[PDB]
């Protein structure tokens, strides 16, 4: 009996504290086998391409290209106008603008009123 | 730094020196090719304790995946020599 | 720049008497300076001027009349 550990988004659960690894089953073992099989196939291909004395360039990585394309050029064709996207876009693209407009307009109206009333003490304020 | 460059003679001497201080191992029966589990009758926990002793004596820690498959003093000497790039 | 000193492997390292006498000299001069300053200017630690007791003062010089005048 000890105080327990609570995982969070920025503090993930340790591997040793994951009960899922202790629920060992034959299909889990086969899944790990095929996972390491595909990893070994990729490693073998990369090592074959990497140790070649005739290759004098850059080993093009399909995964990096896929990552860059999905991040940059695959966004709009998959975009769909949904209520979530609509409200999120409207908020994050309009709200800050109107908030800053309100703040600056209030400040400048206050300053202009103070100037017109003459109670500002703008002495030595030559450079503007 | 100023550290002297160690040789495999030094590595083997230090490994055997550490193993002889292990009272669970009779100093006369131990050799550079003497296996730990069969020739010396040591458990797995004794092997991991030996690996920890080598780590403390040499100042670097061997990864566990590589550590569990070090069964002879010569294997430890060779692994350390490959790690530290020892010529002669 | 210095002299050659070899490793020892589980015994005490080789020490030159030069560093020993230098360290002892500097510790001795630190303690001598501390004692000399404590002797010559002791008011820096234990003070020089006494702290008067506020209650020890009498009512004559504190401007107090016996509760009847003003």
């Amino acid at each position: 009996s000890f105080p327990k550990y609570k995982p969070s988004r920025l503090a993930t659960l340790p591997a040793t504290l994951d009960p899922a690894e202790y629920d060992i089953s034959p299909e889990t073992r086969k899944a790990q086998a095929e996972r390491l099989a595909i990893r070994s196939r990729l490693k073998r291909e990369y090592l074959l391409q990497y140790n070649d004395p005739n290759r004098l360039g850059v080993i093009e990585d399909p995964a990096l290209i896929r990552w860059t394309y999905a991040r940059s050029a695959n966004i709009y064709p998959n975009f769909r106008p949904t209520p979530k996207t609509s409200l999120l876009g409207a908020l994050f693209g309009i709200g800050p603008l109107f908030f800053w407009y309100y703040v600056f307009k209030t400040d400048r109206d206050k300053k202009e009123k103070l100037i017109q009333e003459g109670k500002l003490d703008q002495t030595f304020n030559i450079s503007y | 730094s100023d550290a002297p460059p160690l040789t495999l003679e030094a590595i083997k001497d230090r490994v055997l020196y550490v193993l002889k201080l292990y009272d669970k191992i009779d100093p006369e029966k131990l050799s550079v090719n003497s296996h730990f589990m069969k020739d010396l009758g040591l458990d797995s926990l004794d092997q991991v304790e030996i690996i920890m002793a080598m780590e403390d004596e040499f100042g670097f820690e061997i990864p566990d995946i590589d550590a569990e498959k070090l069964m002879c003093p010569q294997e430890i000497v060779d692994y350390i020599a490959d790690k530290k790039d020892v010529y002669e | 720049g210095g002299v050659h000193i070899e490793p020892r492997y589980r015994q005490f390292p080789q020490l030159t008497r030069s560093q020993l006498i230098q360290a002892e000299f500097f510790s001795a001069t630190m303690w001598f300076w501390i004692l000399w300053r404590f002797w010559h200017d002791s008011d820096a630690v234990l003070g020089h001027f006494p702290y008067p007791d506020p209650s020890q003062w009498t009512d004559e010089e504190l401007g107090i009349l016996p509760d009847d005048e003003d």
């Binding site: 327990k4 550990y5 609570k6 995982p7 969070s8 988004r9 920025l10 503090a11 993930t12 659960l13 340790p14 990893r39 990729l42 490693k43 291909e45 990369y46 080993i59 990585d61 399909p62 995964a63 990096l64 896929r66 990552w67 999905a70 991040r71 | 990864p63 995946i65 | 506020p54 010089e61 504190l62 401007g63």
Partner: protein
């Protein structure tokens, strides 16, 4: 990517990535030079609570100390020439209301 295996023989040891494996959508956010999600010896909520409590207690006690200051049993310091009027601000043509200091 900080919590990946550091002893594995990665193709990109600094990045800790392998050639051909799928790349996380947010890889450039976890690159060992930025936010890392490695487990901590203490639960995140506990550290949050402790830090917030410490900061709040310090601020509250600073406010209390401002409310209840510490000082010595002395009066205000006395300055000779009308509380040093001429050399603090100037204005010599007004003849300020004079104050004189009580010798005790």
């Amino acid at each position: 990517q900080q919590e990946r295996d550091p002893w594995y023989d990665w193709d990109h040891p600094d990045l800790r990535l392998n050639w051909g494996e799928p790349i996380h959508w947010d890889l450039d956010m976890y690159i060992r030079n930025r936010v890392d999600t490695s487990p901590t010896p203490v639960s995140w909520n506990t550290m949050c609570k402790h830090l917030f409590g410490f900061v709040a207690f310090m601020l509250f006690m600073f406010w209390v100390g401002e409310i209840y200051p510490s000082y010595q049993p002395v009066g205000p310091k006395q300055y000779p020439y009308n509380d040093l009027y001429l050399e603090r601000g100037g204005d010599p043509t007004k003849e300020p209301e004079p104050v004189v200091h009580y010798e005790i």
